[PDB]
Design a protein around this nucleic acid. Sequence first.
RNA 1: CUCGUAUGGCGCAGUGGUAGCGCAGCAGAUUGCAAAUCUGUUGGUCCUUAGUUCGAUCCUGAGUGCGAG
RNA 2: CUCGUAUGGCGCAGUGGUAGCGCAGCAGAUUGCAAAUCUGUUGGUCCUUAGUUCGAUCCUGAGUGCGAG
Lengths: 402, 402
Amino acid sequence: SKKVIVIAGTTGVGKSQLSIQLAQKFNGEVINSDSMQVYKDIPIITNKHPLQEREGIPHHVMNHVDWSEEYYSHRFETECMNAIEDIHRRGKIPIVVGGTHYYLQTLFNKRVDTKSSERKLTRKQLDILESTDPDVIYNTLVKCDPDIATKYHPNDYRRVQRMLEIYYKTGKKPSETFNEQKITLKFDTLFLWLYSKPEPLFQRLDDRVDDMLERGALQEIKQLYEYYSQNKFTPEQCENGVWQVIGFKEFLPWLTVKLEDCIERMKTRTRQYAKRQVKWIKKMLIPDIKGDIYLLDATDLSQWDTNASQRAIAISNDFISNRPIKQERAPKALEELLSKGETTMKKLDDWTHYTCNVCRNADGKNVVAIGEKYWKIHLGSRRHKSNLKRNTRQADFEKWKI
Amino acid sequence: SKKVIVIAGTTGVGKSQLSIQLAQKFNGEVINSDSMQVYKDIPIITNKHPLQEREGIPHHVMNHVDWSEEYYSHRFETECMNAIEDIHRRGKIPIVVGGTHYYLQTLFNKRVDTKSSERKLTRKQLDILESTDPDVIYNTLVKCDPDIATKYHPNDYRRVQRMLEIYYKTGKKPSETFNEQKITLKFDTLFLWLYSKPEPLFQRLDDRVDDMLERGALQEIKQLYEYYSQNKFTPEQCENGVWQVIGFKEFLPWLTVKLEDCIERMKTRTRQYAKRQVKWIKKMLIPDIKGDIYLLDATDLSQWDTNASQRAIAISNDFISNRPIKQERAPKALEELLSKGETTMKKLDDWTHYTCNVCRNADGKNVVAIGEKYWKIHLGSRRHKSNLKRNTRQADFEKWKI
RNA sequence: CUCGUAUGGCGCAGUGGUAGCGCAGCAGAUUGCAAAUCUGUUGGUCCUUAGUUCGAUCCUGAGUGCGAG
RNA sequence: CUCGUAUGGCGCAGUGGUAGCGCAGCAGAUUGCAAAUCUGUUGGUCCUUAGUUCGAUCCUGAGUGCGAG
Ligand SMILES: [Mg+2]
Ligand SMILES: [Mg+2]
Ligand SMILES: [Mg+2]
Ligand SMILES: [Mg+2]
Ligand SMILES: [Mg+2]
Ligand SMILES: [Mg+2]
Ligand SMILES: [Mg+2]
Ligand SMILES: [Mg+2]
Ligand SMILES: [Mg+2]
Ligand SMILES: [Mg+2]
Ligand SMILES: [Mg+2]
Ligand SMILES: [Mg+2]
Ligand SMILES: [Mg+2]
Ligand SMILES: [Mg+2]
Ligand SMILES: [Mg+2]
Ligand SMILES: [Mg+2]
Ligand SMILES: [Zn+2]
Ligand SMILES: [Zn+2]
């Protein structure tokens, strides 16, 4: 049927260069899936692929959202799906490339629809949703559909809220809506993952940042600060829209000698981002597509043309020709990455909650662990031990007095 | 979503015993997928699972077709699909077990519908279909949609015919009908493959046959011969319906001291059957479901409870609980079976035809090879060589005669 | 004791110029027959020996093996 | 050759009764914010050392160490 090629991986692994080669080599167009590249201008820090390097290959859902807007999942779903459709009926093959792998879920119906399902929210319902109180919204969720509630932590405000929002707008338990989902890949998709050993990557990513603040990144940081300022924006705003970008909020303190510190902080966010991406690919993406993915070793850039270019053009050539793939799926070196051990094995599968009546966080609430495995980690952490000692010694004083 | 469990493998590997355990252990019913077990009575040779061993677990699409009928793919598709539906709405989980893995295709839309698409066949069209002439029907196919025709051998009458039949009844090129197919797994399916090393299996299968002609198989062979006779049936009939069974046509010569020979012939068909099943599972089934299958080592029956029962009950437990599977998917020992090398690598992917103008079969037609790889095998076979020598030596009598 | 036959794993063809086929084995295919069907292909130097002959798997002798009298 | 002064990977505190805070690091979560967000956690027993005291990282005397006339 209608094919679709997706390229996953961290940054600094040639995700773009490959997206193009395939585009020219197989008559396709690119669809961006980076939650930050969808914003206007600000290319250097948002790391966009320079036009004079796109060989005139079309690109969709990229650089068109105004800084005043807030991009999100569903928005991408309607936009991405449109590009796919269009590109198909035009006899071309879509090549979705991005860093926000979370969005890829759209390619296999992994989301709930609360748009078409309209419903006036009750004064009572809203008062609970938009409530300022902490666990008031959580206790409500536990009340109606405790199945889904036992899958989140009481502090996961963003999500606990979302869940309830669904229970209301759809009048159907979210937990049930899931046990009924298909989660089957739409269209015939081919997943290509460009990977590189952590160490070599980190080195590259570090330098990539160094000379990145030379090619004129600072000017973009200033520009963002311009819009940031003259708009009475507080640092709290760095949780929505283009303000989440890695390359701005890191220099906010410098923008009120110490600039060299905001850089290190940026380099760090970058590494963390890369690490989380791989974690997602191994524990979220792969498990979902049942491990139907092909790795491409991009550790030693020196090579690439062989380990990435050829290898991918090969797999893709067979894919497009609506045929089975004979490729190994993962080069001897990266074999373990596709192992159950490095993937579905790590997923949490025990959601029973536990509460330590002796441990409590700064927010006042008591420590609650999820999953027996982790409940024990806590019961053995220095945190718990220490608290357990002050408690005993305290309860002991009287034992002596008496 | 609605789950479905399938059990594949050769015979004599406990396919049934497992189908039951899972049925009791997970609230399910069995669906038979054996092209021969769907016939009435004749249990011993068709190897049906004795009732007093089904723990009262329901079974569908099994033992209900009258010897006068001819079961087939689509028939199974409508019947199997019905049992699935019914079993589902009743809160149960279907467990399809069978030896005819070819039928499993139904679980992932791998077929063409020429029923609902009615159309009066033209006198001209039919005259060509029901034609007695050899390659008359083939040349026609090559004319209308040569793409699909280059995928079959001119002697594959059964299939070349079917292909044309589709071109007519659907007025749409079959080749195109395929490039548009989805071939996506319907429902959420779990494939369990019960495998056993060839040697030990064969030993078991041989004895299984020995004492099989003791438990009263002969009486069934006689019964079949009864219906066979008093019906003016020729041995040619052993290409349709229950007459294809392995355990009858092998004794036809004995039914016109030499009986002991029909047995060996039977044991042989049995082995071949087992070997072809695995070839199918490795080159046909697996490649189609993208290798999403779990192996269960049943070589040493002595164990089984551990390698088969537990292992499967474990995977199944996680599967049913709508969760990701942490199981290894393949025991260290059988690992290579799921390798690309033992699967999609073996598939034919070069369909260009070749004709040896010097080699010809008894039917008079010339030898035609499919696939460069095989075209060369022919050009190097003793057959070709020998024919090439008589040709030269013969043409050498021309220089001398001139 | 009479007369026969002795060919790749088995069952069989064959010609005076160094041999073919069926089955099994191995392999490819499989979108209404599938426990079925189609397709390709690896194995022999024609029991041993001495002669006849330009030359023998095939002709003659002998030995050995199996075969019916 | 007189002074400061060094405490988990780094940056810094600190009570006589066997230690912290920030960074990082590790880990789990993710179904409209995801380059975000939530959550759980490994790390040194306090420069080396002799004594002072019931006791010591914190009191004292050396030796080590970087810096300081
Ligand atoms: Mg590159
Ligand atoms: Mg703007
Ligand atoms: Mg929200
Ligand atoms: Mg991390
Ligand atoms: Mg058993
Ligand atoms: Mg079959
Ligand atoms: Mg075979
Ligand atoms: Mg031959
Ligand atoms: Mg013989
Ligand atoms: Mg002969
Ligand atoms: Mg043949
Ligand atoms: Mg002579
Ligand atoms: Mg001689
Ligand atoms: Mg932290
Ligand atoms: Mg992310
Ligand atoms: Mg001391
Ligand atoms: Zn605690
Ligand atoms: Zn030839």
